[PDB]
Amino acid sequence: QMRLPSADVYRFAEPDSEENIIFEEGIPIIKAGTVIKLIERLTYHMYADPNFVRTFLTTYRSFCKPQELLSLIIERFEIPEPEPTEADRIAIENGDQPLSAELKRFRKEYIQPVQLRVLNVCRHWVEHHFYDFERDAYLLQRMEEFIGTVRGKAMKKWVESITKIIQRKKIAHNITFQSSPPTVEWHISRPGHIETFDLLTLHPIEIARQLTLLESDLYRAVQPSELVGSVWTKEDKEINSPNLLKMIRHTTNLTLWFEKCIVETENLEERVAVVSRIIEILQVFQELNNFNGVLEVVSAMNSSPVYRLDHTFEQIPSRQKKILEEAHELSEDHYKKYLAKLRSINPPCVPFFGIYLTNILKTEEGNPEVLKRHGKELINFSKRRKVAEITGEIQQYQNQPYCLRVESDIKRFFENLNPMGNSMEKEFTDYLFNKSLEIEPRNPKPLPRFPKKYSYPLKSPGVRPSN
Amino acid sequence: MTEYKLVVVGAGDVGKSALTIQLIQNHFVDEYDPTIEDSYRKQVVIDGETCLLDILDTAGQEEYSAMRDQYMRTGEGFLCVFAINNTKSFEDIHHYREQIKRVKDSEDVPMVLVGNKCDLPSRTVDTKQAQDLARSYGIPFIETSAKTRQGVDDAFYTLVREIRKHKE
Amino acid sequence: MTEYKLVVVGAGDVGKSALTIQLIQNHFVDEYDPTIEDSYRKQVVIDGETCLLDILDTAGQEEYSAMRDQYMRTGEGFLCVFAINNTKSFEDIHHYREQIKRVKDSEDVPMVLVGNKCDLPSRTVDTKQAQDLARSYGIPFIETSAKTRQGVDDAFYTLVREIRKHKE
Numbered sequence A: 001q002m003r004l005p006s007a008d009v010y011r012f013a014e015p016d017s018e019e020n021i022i023f024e025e026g027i028p029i030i031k032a033g034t035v036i037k038l039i040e041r042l043t044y045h046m047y048a049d050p051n052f053v054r055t056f057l058t059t060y061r062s063f064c065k066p067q068e069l070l071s072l073i074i075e076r077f078e079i080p081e082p083e084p085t086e087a088d089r090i091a092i093e094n095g096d097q098p099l100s101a102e103l104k105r106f107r108k109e110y111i112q113p114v115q116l117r118v119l120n121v122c123r124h125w126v127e128h129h130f131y132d133f134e135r136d137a138y139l140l141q142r143m144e145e146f147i148g149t150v151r152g153k154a155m156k157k158w159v160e161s162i163t164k165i166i167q168r169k170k171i172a173h174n175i176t177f178q179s180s181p182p183t184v185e186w187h188i189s190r191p192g193h194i195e196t197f198d199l200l201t202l203h204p205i206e207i208a209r210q211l212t213l214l215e216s217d218l219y220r221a222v223q224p225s226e227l228v229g230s231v232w233t234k235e236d237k238e239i240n241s242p243n244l245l246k247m248i249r250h251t252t253n254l255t256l257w258f259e260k261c262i263v264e265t266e267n268l269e270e271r272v273a274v275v276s277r278i279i280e281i282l283q284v285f286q287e288l289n290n291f292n293g294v295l296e297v298v299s300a301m302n303s304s305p306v307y308r309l310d311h312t313f314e315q316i317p318s319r320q321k322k323i324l325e326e327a328h329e330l331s332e333d334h335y336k337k338y339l340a341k342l343r344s345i346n347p348p349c350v351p352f353f354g355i356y357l358t359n360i361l362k363t364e365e366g367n368p369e370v371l372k373r374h375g376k377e378l379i380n381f382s383k384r385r386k387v388a389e390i391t392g393e394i395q396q397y398q399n400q401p402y403c404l405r406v407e408s409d410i411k412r413f414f415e416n417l418n419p420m421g422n423s424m425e426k427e428f429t430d431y432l433f434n435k436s437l438e439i440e441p442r443n444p445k446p447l448p449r450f451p452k453k454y455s456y457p458l459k460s461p462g463v464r465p466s467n
Numbered sequence B, C: 001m002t003e004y005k006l007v008v009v010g011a012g013d014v015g016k017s018a019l020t021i022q023l024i025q026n027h028f029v030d031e032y033d034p035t036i037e038d039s040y041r042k043q044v045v046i047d048g049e050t051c052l053l054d055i056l057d058t059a060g061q062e063e064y065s066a067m068r069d070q071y072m073r074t075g076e077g078f079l080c081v082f083a084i085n086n087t088k089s090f091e092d093i094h095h096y097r098e099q100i101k102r103v104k105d106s107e108d109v110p111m112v113l114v115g116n117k118c119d120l121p122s123r124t125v126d127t128k129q130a131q132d133l134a135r136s137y138g139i140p141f142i143e144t145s146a147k148t149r150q151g152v153d154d155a156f157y158t159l160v161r162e163i164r165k166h167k168e
């Protein structure tokens, strides 16, 4: 190959061996390595592995401090020239202008790629994972000291880019659609009257479209820094993961709201009309590929207060019972039928964090932090590559937005949902169940008739849009 | 080959994911992949009869509080896991048992109280108190340690035996 | 999902990054910053069969990113982009195609010529001229603009059709 600089003056020139790095059995996939090797493969010169830059920078805070990583990036960027050969010295010794046959190759195959990928890591680090520099104001200063050090007309355009990004990130996305958004669909409730909004007054579609926009927005705000450390379960959940916990707590609100609407409707004829309205909404969630909503209506019909309502489910038309059995099969058998649906759709999506949270958490517990081979402790990069495949599977769904019109009046009604009221989690769950024992008492007690509650008609406009 | 559906139930700080893993990772801890089907499904021989365990462990989804009813409905037997360290997790077992009871709608549900992280010191819960609680419920009690894999097999096997007994 | 490793090649300042972000995130970037290596991942359905595009974004600055031969080794189909208001980048397509064939060591590599920057009133390159170049290579020709999101969804989808025909 080529004569890399001496391993004494340059740490990263040390040759690969089973005591440094382990490759998984055309780009090699590294199973483990010492830190020095990981930054060597992060900015390797032979091949381009732009996943590695994203996999390393997401998960490296377990094994390398942010301050220590940047010290390795400086040491990688400053590559010393290899010692000249004897003939090259003879020109150098006598003052003759040396041909530099090997140095000319070295600067084009080793320095130029490696110095260029180091700035790629530096700009990728600043642009995406900027929270490292905000927390540590000393790190940003060392970052800007390094950028000023970069010299040459080559790579003088890039240090303009990193600097532009830093000044943009320090002080802190218009979307273009090929198609016009479909027009808002209205029902008994008329636009602008927030006081008359409810489950039956609003059109089934527009409940489902505004919930999809509301839930998509909460899904697109979840950054990988709130998942990679298994941090949402730690005692700093509200500081580390405010975006993720706002989406979980929204999904819980709708599920209890769907429970509350079903069991609080005393009259059987009304209640059947409500349960059918919710299933019509669950049907639009499947059209919009809003799988979070599908599993927050399915989770309401499988809840203990609502599952037992066997009288109100017999009166549902068999068409809408076919939807609920189809929608409930997504969650059966460890989400096997839902995982196959998530990978065979044209995504605008709202996937379900239920299964990305239980995979990130079990991947971090199961696999060992370090691999010990030949008596040396290598960082288990296979553990942190599996984790970054999940946080990299979240992001391939966050990119594409929805082509739906945001209705400010409805979207405010769903952000301000308080099904619990002032009650606590256990009291409400009991309050819903006991109210379910009141409206359909357990056998053999009779089913008592109850007064009608809603004044407006209960005919459902249907999942079909008006166009 | 009967397939028993087991569900691990507990709080988020009692380390139940470690319990499921230690059941599955019996040989080596070099590798673990929760996505593939072999991670939550294990074929085991119990009392001379072969059977299959399909364990629904939902660690990390503890904040999805409304979806607990849907998860516990799938399984036939349940583990109620409480950390010996956390005295708070001990009074939380009652609610998990009550919820399991009203989901399956039956007064007697195949269940096994499990005490996790038993090996570490600062045992805020005594063995006698947990044994008394299990006697009150009528369910077995098992002490398991997530680190040393001590008693995990006992816990899952005793749950399987309770599932079999409730069937007959 | 079958995975397609698209590679976006082209001269500098033609819109490879704006055209790729426009497909991925549906938002147009106006600030111009040179890109060494970007990799974007998209899942789409193309002709009914769901595929996962792995769109590697290359660098366009000659002599300022000399790793070009490294990207072309790993790609399946290429997307030669030139800016129609920029004549110089149009002739450069021939060098890119020559550099692609040598690396892939074949003369039938799946390619698409894409003429970016349509919304700009100045036209230093005519559509008739570009199609004539596209006709000789046999690769199709797509007329795209990143700001108005015209043809950007058809440009990448066409290249997947070209790879699909080539693969069998």
Ligand SMILES: Nc1nc2c(ncn2[C@@H]2O[C@H](COP(=O)(O)OP(=O)(O)NP(=O)(O)O)[C@@H](O)[C@H]2O)c(=O)[nH]1
Binding pocket: C010, C011, C012, C013, C014, C015, C016, C017, C018, C019, C029, C030, C031, C032, C033, C034, C035, C036, C058, C059, C060, C061, C116, C117, C118, C119, C120, C144, C145, C146, C147, C148
């Ligand atoms: N008006 C207009 N401007 C465009 C269009 N496409 C790209 N641009 C602009 O032209 C410039 C090109 O940006 P960019 O997409 O980054 O080009 P690039 O190919 O990535 N440059 P490089 O290859 O060095 O990375 C940017 O200012 C971008 O906003 C278009 O269709 N219309």
Ligand SMILES: [Mg+2]
Binding pocket: C016, C017, C033, C034, C035, C036, C057, C058, C059, C060
């Ligand atoms: Mg670019």
